[PDB]
Structure formats: C-alpha cells, structure tokens
C-alpha cells in the first residue's frame, strides 16, 4: 500500500544537523547547556526564527535578531558571552560542514526506481549570505533525484503547523496511510502521525534505513553498488551551432566551469556519454557532448570527403569560435579518440588537455600505404568491407534493431568474427537474426539509437572509413612533432580491435603521457565500466587540467 | 579598383612585435647588439625557426634549439651569457605583453563595412606552452573581424616564399592589383610588390593609417566613435530547454566564465541585447540571452495566468536547474527588470548579483489595489487599454512593420502620446501610417522583430499586463524583506514612462544599492546608448560579481 516517501533535508538527507552544531559550540565555548538553542527558539511562533522559516525575513536580517536573543538569554542565565562571539561565524561553519548523507540518498533513489513518489519537506530560509552558493549547489544536487521539493520559506507555512502536512498530501495526491515520513525532530513527526502517515525518527542512518526496509519490503542496506546517474534526453539543454552553410552541429550541455568536449565513436551518439555527463558537471566542469558529423541531429552530407580528419578537425575549431571558447579539454573514444589526438597535434592552443579511451596515437608510416597496413592485420579485414559505397549501408540499415543489438555487447557476449568478413560477404552472415539483449543496455536505450539512425542512416558514419589515403597524407605533416600538453591514454583490456598493446610505443611521441587501464572492459568503454571511467577522468581533470 | 586588404598580426595588428622585445632584452642584459636576432635566424631556410614557422615542430620543441643557437652565437662573439638566461622566460613575457593595436583593427573594420574583403597572413607557430591560452584568446578576438586567417604553420609555407602569396590570391579570388598588403618587415613586402600588390610598410600606426587612407579614399583616422560589435543571429549558438511539458525556452549563448542571464522587456526579443552579448563575453563572462515566455522561439501559451510573475520566476529557476547552474547574475530591462527584482526577493541563493535598466523596485501597496494606483498616474493610461483580450492585439498585429517603427524611436523622435489612449481608442490613432525610420535601428533590424512576431503574435507578450491583481498579492509576501545581495539600478534620463524619480526611495529596501545614470537616454536603453550600458555593466560585474 505504501507508494510515497518524504524526507527532511537537515539531519536526514544532509549531515550534520544545524542544531548539532549549536550544542557543539556551547561545549567548545564553555557556555551554559542549551543557551544557543534557547535563543534560537526565543518567542515561538512570534519569534524571529519562525518569521525566518516562513519567508517573512531573510537569513541576513535574522542574524542580528538571533544575536540579541543570545544576549537576552545570557543576562537571565547570569553569564558573560565571549568577545569573539559571532552568530554569523557559527552559522557559516555549520552550513558549510553539511554534506549529503550518501546512504540515505541511495535509499531514496532505490525507492523511486521501484515506483515510489519521493519528496523533500524542509524548514529552510532565504539565504542571502555572501557564501550562499554552497547551499544552492547542495539543493541542485538533491532536487534532481526527487519528485517534489517543498520549502517552508516558499509556501509561507512551517513544520509542525498542520496546514503544511495537508499541503503535502494534496501535492502528492495521496492518502496519509500511503506515505512514509522521515524526520530527525520528534515534534515534526507528531502531526504526520495524527493524520495516519508512517513515521520514522532519524537518530542514526543505519537504524533509520532498517526501519524503512521493514516497512517497504524493499532491500536498501547491503545492496550492490548502483550505476552512476544517467541523463534523460528530454531534460537536457539542446544546442545548435551552424559551422558552415550546409553543416550544423548538435550538442547537449550541462554544468559550469572549464569546458570539456566529448567525442563519440562508431556507430554511436552524444547519448554514449550518458553516464559521464552528470558526473563531470557535478565535479565542476561544463560538459558539451557532441553528435559528431554524420550522426543524430547533426548534418549528414552524403559526400565522402566531408568526413576526412582535416575537415572534421577544422569544424571543431569553428565550433569553439562560435561558442566563444578559447580552449576546451578534448575527450574522445574510438573514431572520436583518433580526432582528439589530431586536435592536439594541429591545434594545441585550443586544447587545454587531451584524453583518449581505447584509441591509441599511431603515427603515419610514410613508407607504407594505409590500405596495405590494413591488409597486414587480419582483425582489420572489416575495414575493406566498409570501403564500397552502398554495400555495408544496405546490410546495416536492413534491420536497425538487429544492428545495435548485435554490436552493443560486452566482451564475453560477442556475436561477430572480425576476420574473413569480406570472404563471408557481411558482418552479420554468421549471426542470429534476433540477438539477445546485452547486460550493458536496456531495450529503451537501444531504441534511442534506432530513432537517431532512422533519420540519418549509415552513409555519413561509414564515410569516416572512406578517407584512408587523404588522412594518411595529412597526418604525414606531423611526424616531426611531439604532444607536449597534458595527455591521458586509457586502455581497455578486452577490446579485441583496439588492443592495449597497440599503445605501447606512445611515450616516444607524448613523453609525459599519463596512463589509465581498465580490466575486463570491452570496446564500449563508457557504458561497460561507467564508474571506472568517471573515476579515471575526474582524477586526471582535477590534477592536469585545472 | 582596390577591394581586398591583408594585414600581418605581429607588429601591425598586435603590439609590440616579438623582434622588438629581442632588441630590448639585448640592451637590458648588456649583450652584444643583434646577438638574439642572429640566433633567431640561424640557418635560414634550414634553421630551427623556419621549421617552427612551417609547422614541422612545436614552440616547446624549438626553445632548446634556439637556446643552442644563442650559445653558438656567443662563442663566436667571444662573450659570456648570464646564468639567469632563459629563452622561455624571454618569450613568455614578449608574447604576453602583446595587445591589439585598437586603431589598426578599427581601420580594418571600417574597410570591411565599406565592401572590402579583409585577411590576416602571418608567420606563426604551434603554441604548446602552459601559457598558450593568452594567444588563443587574442586570435579569437581578431578572427571574428576578418574574412580569412592564413597562418604559416597551418599551410606549411612561410613569408617570404613566393608560394604563400600565390596561395593568398587564390583564397581571396582576386588579382594582385586589387590587394593592399600591410607588414612591418620589409623583406615580407618584397614578393607582394613583385606580383603587383599595393604595399604599406608599418613603422608607426598613424603614418601607416594615413597611407592606407590615401590609397583607399576612405576616412580612417579622426573618424567618429564606432558602435560596439553587434552579433549575427545565424552565427550564434542556439539553445533550447524544456522547462515544463508545454513550455520550451530559447536562448542564445556566448563566452566562458560566470553565467550572466539577460532578460528583455516589451515588445522585444533576445536580439535587444545584440550590442551587450559580444562585449560581456569578451570581458570574461558566459552570456545567456533569453527569448522570454511569449516571444520568438520560446513557447507562447494563450492562457493569461501563464504570464503572472510567480510562474515566470519559477520557470527561470527550472531553466538554471536544467542547465546545471547553481547561480547566475540576472540583468533585466523593462518587464525583464521587474522579473529580476523578484528573482532576488524570492530566490537569492540562485542570484549571484542583480541589475535593472530603467525599471525601479516598487514595493506593493497593501492598502491600494493595483488598478487604482494605475488610474492615479495619467501616463499609465495605456495599461488599462491593454487589459481587454483581443483589443490591443488586433491593433498591434494589423501592421507589424508599422508597430515596430512607431515604438523603437529615440526620445526626441517620439510619435505617441501615452495619456488618453483609452479616450482616443488606440495607441496609433494620432500616428502616421508609414512612420520614418529611427536613427537607433536599421531596416534589417526592424525586419528581425517582424519575423519573430509573425510566428508568436501579441497575445503572450500582452498577457504580462493582465495579471495586475495576481502579481500584487504575490508581492505582498515580501514586504518584510530587504535585498542584501549585490545590486545595481541604472536610470535613463529621458524615459517618459519609467522616470528616474520613480527609483528615489530604493535605498530603503536595498541599503547598499549601487547606482548608474545615463543622460539623454530614452526607454530603449540597450540600443539607444550601447557603449554607456556596456561600460556601466562591465565595471559593476568586475567589482560586485566576481
Ligand atoms: C584509425 S584507428 O586505428 O584509430 N581506428 C580503428 C577502427 C576504430 N573503430 C572501429 O572500427 N570500431 C568498430 C566498433 C564495432 C566493432 C568492430 C566493427 C565495427 C563495430 C567498428 C570495430 C576507429 C579508429
Ligand atoms: C510594473 S512596472 O512598473 O515595473 N512596469 C511598468 C510598464 C513597463 N513597460 C511598459 O509598459 N513599456 C512600454 C514600452 C513602449 C512605450 C510605452 C507603451 C508600450 C511600448 C509599453 C511603455 C514594464 C514594467
């Protein structure tokens, strides 16, 4: 029967509670016990704190009224307050020490995932201090995980007034016996109980979660490590920049701080970075995730030569110019990773830092044609199949659902043999017509790619392979250079095409290269090991690109 | 006959030249004259500097080769180099001291405006130093004003090789006698002259501009103060955020740094901030210029109550949440300025700083209905005309060209009487059917607004006036508050509706309010006095919001 869960911010979603810091201050300053808590509630509903929680006055307006209540309290207590005493300093440190109670948020997320409506109901103030950004940042991180956020100062009502609980029930569109309410202050539970709601008194997190487990029948404690937050296409800010008359690039944008540009591979989308976008934004970066030329909502001209590296790199520079960005950190994967090494070799001033996932930097061989180096590697046989225009397109567009289900699989779930693709006459000749769904992706995630490739097709994406000779001549101009800006190479142990050993001589060209290695990871790195990728990127960004 | 003008970067568009700093270093370190310039050119076409300018090696790779050339030069000169000597320190300071030669750029802009094709042809390097952002920032500011930017290190050719001048002519699609070429190095002029191009040797800027004046027949020196750079709609990054199921907000974005949100008035567009967008981005800010709800590419629902202040403010907060911005500086004008005061009163944690142009903060009167305060002011008579749905829409949509030409006029060019609008039965009853074009706007600029209002109409925009009672009740909740975050009020001397005297008691509610005043400025502040507005905003942002 339970279908909604309500949490308080202070003392349940964020720790430690403000009241906890008032008691710690009394002890530290050798003040009479309870003195600061008495001044805090001085007057009850008529008092300064009630006016503050109702939104009648701001936090900066309340500070001198609280200072006064401390003096009036100390005169009756026959005590002398120190000359260092400042309500502002006490509150600045208390508000700043508060951090998200990770196990409580994890439990809220699990309940929402299992069908629950979740909400935060808190007694809070209008913060106009010079340090108010810390609070804004906290609320933003939390509000994306809950259906509703009800703040006292916005609705003009406070807990424990009975009107605020009636307002909650009408917002949730639920009966009181369908709601669980968690709060660390007993007085605030009193009216929730009178109405018939299930209440949990939060003293410690573990005991509170055990009570929540019993009452919901869902496992919350000792649960496996959850996947990172993935973003929703319809909730993203969508950007469109025209880089040249017939070419418009589409990107998705989130966050503030140094710009980080994400470049997907074949046959993918901006959506392939869904697990990295919210994490990098939360770490302090402005993320721009591209739909590369030939894909999704970006232009897809039919001409082969529109997809040679030289053209693709020039358009990326124009993209930064039109956005008004002098520099960006470039992070690529697969074909995108190849592009970012060439952005660092040809436009170092525009690249703050460079990172590639799976794709190594391979210098061009001036003594051997690229088509003969391709024939030397039997794993790269499929690249010869991709050369004839129309051939690979017809097979890949014949059944879009089959194409993405056959490709997006973990390394143990493989269903294709990359050698003798030309002999066999196709990539899916020895493959099932209806392949099983991989453990990496959901049906809905596969359907997103199917929708994007129904508009564009495979001509644009396949043309990235039809410029071997043009790319070879252009890359031969950089054989005397070294990459001397911050660089990161991330290898994937189980990528059977882009094997880790292909990157072993990279230190000859990038002397101060930083490395990362991911075990049991296949070709589709971002969605195969999302937490590992996020950890490696954030650690490197904070040190080499700040 | 002249139709193209080519400029060099070092020593002509940017001062001082690198070579000038080499001579100053020799003098400062008591080194033999010419020693540093000899090491710089050691080897000629075989030398390290030629390989650097051709893109064969990067700047960081050239530094130790130049250091070596300095030692080989000092051994023959029988001199001892100091133990402080560092080519890296010398070049870091030289590159950093270089600033745009404002009169030269102004002259280039004037020529382009008069039909010329303009270009930069420079011998430059691939800069991979830790300080390379200074150079990237410089090139970005310059490249937006020129048709082509040809850099030696990108084309593999250097000046004075004859092949680079032939490459220039084919890019410009022009005959040599149709081109003017400016350079500070005589040797680089030599091949331009052999081909038949008009050449100007730059020793000092003033003499160079006088030569350029004689040869083009256009006045460049002693010319009036130009208007700030205005942006082109088709070159902007266009953003779309869905804030609620039926409502999508459109914005234009440029720059990097702290976020600045621009909010236009009635009946305007994001385009009303065209002169402020490039200036604020150049000052170090990330500018987001909104199409407010009811206008342009933003949603325009027909319901009146979708345009009350409470709804408009909540959507602005959702806009920041979806973009991943904890805070933004809010700058409004007219109806937008009213909105930003309410964003600071109701959501201070999300507002880094607040500024209003023309619109004062007016607290609600709890003893008087807003419709009776409106009747007390005869200038606000037109607000009663706007109340009946359909009435003002039909008159304003009857002739879109007439509407924007009648409204967008300077204070001396006024063509409407705001009193007895209801008696007369319309805003344009005593107005000409074909009004003259104002000095503030071009025909093309008027046509941009006509195109935007052809899609949307005037229902949405007029609905912002049809919530007097709802806005009054909501604002009565803030009568106990004070605005205690950084605030700026900018008054316009000749605004006959929003008169400066309407803001005189603002210090009672915003004690530390900063003020700005613009003389001879009417209602349309941004486009009436663009340079003054930019100056006032940038000075305030750099001090109160950094
Ligand atoms: C030029 S490169 O060596 O940097 N190059 C190699 C091939 C790579 N991409 C690639 O071919 N990946 C796929 C990904 C799956 C699996 C297999 C076949 C098909 C679908 C293409 C390899 C891009 C970069
Ligand atoms: C509620 S307020 O006092 O902040 N309010 C007053 C009116 C103002 N805007 C306004 O009415 N401006 C116009 C601009 C031109 C000139 C005249 C008539 C018409 C076209 C509207 C005033 C918006 C803010």
Numbering used by the authors:
A (entry chain A), B (entry chain A): 2 to 547
Article excerpt on this structure:
To explore the utility of SX in a drug discovery setting, we selected a pharmaceutically relevant target – soluble epoxide hydro­lase (sEH) – as a model system. sEH is an enzyme that binds epoxides and converts them to their corresponding diols. The human protein is 62.5 kDa in size and consists of a C-terminal and an N-terminal domain connected by a short proline-rich linker. The C-terminal domain exhibits hydro­lase activity and the N-terminal domain is suggested to have phosphatase activity.
The large, potent ligands (compounds 1–4) have distinct chemical features, such as the adamatyl moiety of compounds 1 and 2, and the tetrahedral sulfur atoms of compounds 2 and 3 which are readily recognizable and could be unambiguously modelled in the electron-density maps. Interestingly, the fraction of indexed images varies between 6 and 69%, with compound 2 being the outlier on the low side. In comparison with previously published cryo-T structures of the same protein–ligand complexes, we found that the ligands generally bind in a similar fashion in the RT and the cryo-T structures.
